Amino acid sequence: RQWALEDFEIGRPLGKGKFGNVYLAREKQSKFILALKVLFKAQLEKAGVEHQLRREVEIQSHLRHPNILRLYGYFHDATRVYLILEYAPLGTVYRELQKLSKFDEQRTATYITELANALSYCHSKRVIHRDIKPENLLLGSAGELKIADFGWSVCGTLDYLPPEMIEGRMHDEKVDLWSLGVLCYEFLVGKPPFEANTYQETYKRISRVEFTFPDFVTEGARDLISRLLKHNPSQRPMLREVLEHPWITANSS
Ligand SMILES: CC[C@@H](NC(=O)c1cc2[nH]nc(NC(=O)c3ccc(N4CCN(C)CC4)cc3)c2s1)c1ccccc1
Numbered sequence: 502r503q504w505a506l507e508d509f510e511i512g513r514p515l516g517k518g519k520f521g522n523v524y525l526a527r528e529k530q531s532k533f534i535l536a537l538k539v540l541f542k543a544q545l546e547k548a549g550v551e552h553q554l555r556r557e558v559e560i561q562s563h564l565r566h567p568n569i570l571r572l573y574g575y576f577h578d579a580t581r582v583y584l585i586l587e588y589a590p591l592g593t594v595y596r597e598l599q600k601l602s603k604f605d606e607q608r609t610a611t612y613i614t615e616l617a618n619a620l621s622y623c624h625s626k627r628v629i630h631r632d633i634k635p636e637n638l639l640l641g642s643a644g645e646l647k648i649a650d651f652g653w654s655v656c657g658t659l660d661y662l663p664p665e666m667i668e669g670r671m672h673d674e675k676v677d678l679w680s681l682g683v684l685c686y687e688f689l690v691g692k693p694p695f696e697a698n699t700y701q702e703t704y705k706r707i708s709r710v711e712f713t714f715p716d717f718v719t720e721g722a723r724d725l726i727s728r729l730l731k732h733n734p735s736q737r738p739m740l741r742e743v744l745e746h747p748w749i750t751a752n753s754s
Contacts, residue, residue, distance in 0.1 A: 504585065509527065510526065520540050520550075523537065525537075537586070542582060558584065560654055564623070572587075573585040593639055597640065613749060614749065616648070618740070621741065624740070628654055629674040632650065633681070633684060634680070660693045663734070673734060678738060683695070695711070710731075721748030724746075729743075
């Protein structure tokens with residue numbers, strides 16, 4: 502409860518964002534290691550999401566799950582807000598991917614699991630994430646997926662956002678079964694299923710729902726992705742169904 506910008510010995514920057522950045526930091530009394538996210542008040546409104554933050558902070562801190570990154574506390578000074586976040590030692594599913602190009606079945610399978618279960622829970626507890634992309638996943642020392650950033654849970658790249666949303670229509674929590682599908686595809690193939698060179702065609706690709714599997718994609722996965730990526734929210738499985746899918750279990754952990 503209420504720390505000050507002076508309980509913190511600040512260290513390596515972990516990420517440089519538009520609104521703010523995020524640092525390695527250690528609380529001086531406890532020697533605790535956290536990610537100190539430092540957002541800037543000025544821009545949050547010059548953008549308007551000052552409230553899409555009121556959501557992340559409230560939503561975050563109230564959640565307890567091994568694959569969701571913990572918000573520990575928060576305090577703003579006069580210039581900016583600070584968010585004492587949990588620290589994720591292995592970095593992002595994003596770098597991990599650029600690093601390795603493609604993930605294997607077991608790895609992809611496991612992550613979808615961790616993300617499924619983590620995602621189920623958010624849904625058990627009523628909440629939907631939406632903005633699930635590789636940039637927002639982090640890895641613990643154990644090496645396990647963890648979900649970060651919510652401010653978008655209750656512009657940029659369309660790549661992971663389902664038809665409904667994008668097409669404006671009111672949306673629910675199928676959103677995330679769609680991402681979970683794109684997510685899945687991206688891991689196994691390395692690009693997301695609706696990759697394009699422009700915002701324009703990418704809209705097309707997602708709305709017409711146009712994607713094609715590389716030769717080395719297995720049917721077990723092939724099938725999985727195809728029931729996550731249906732244009733109609735209704736025809737999208739529940740996470741329990743997902744965790745059931747065979748490929749998803751004879752390959753997870
Ligand atoms: C999801 C993006 C969001 N980020 C967070 O909330 C974040 C929360 C959070 N907790 N821990 C982090 N740690 C790291 O970012 C990290 C990155 C690379 C690392 N390695 C160095 C090289 N090595 C070979 C692998 C390990 C280790 C830790 C981050 S980022 C964000 C939002 C606004 C502004 C900045 C960042």
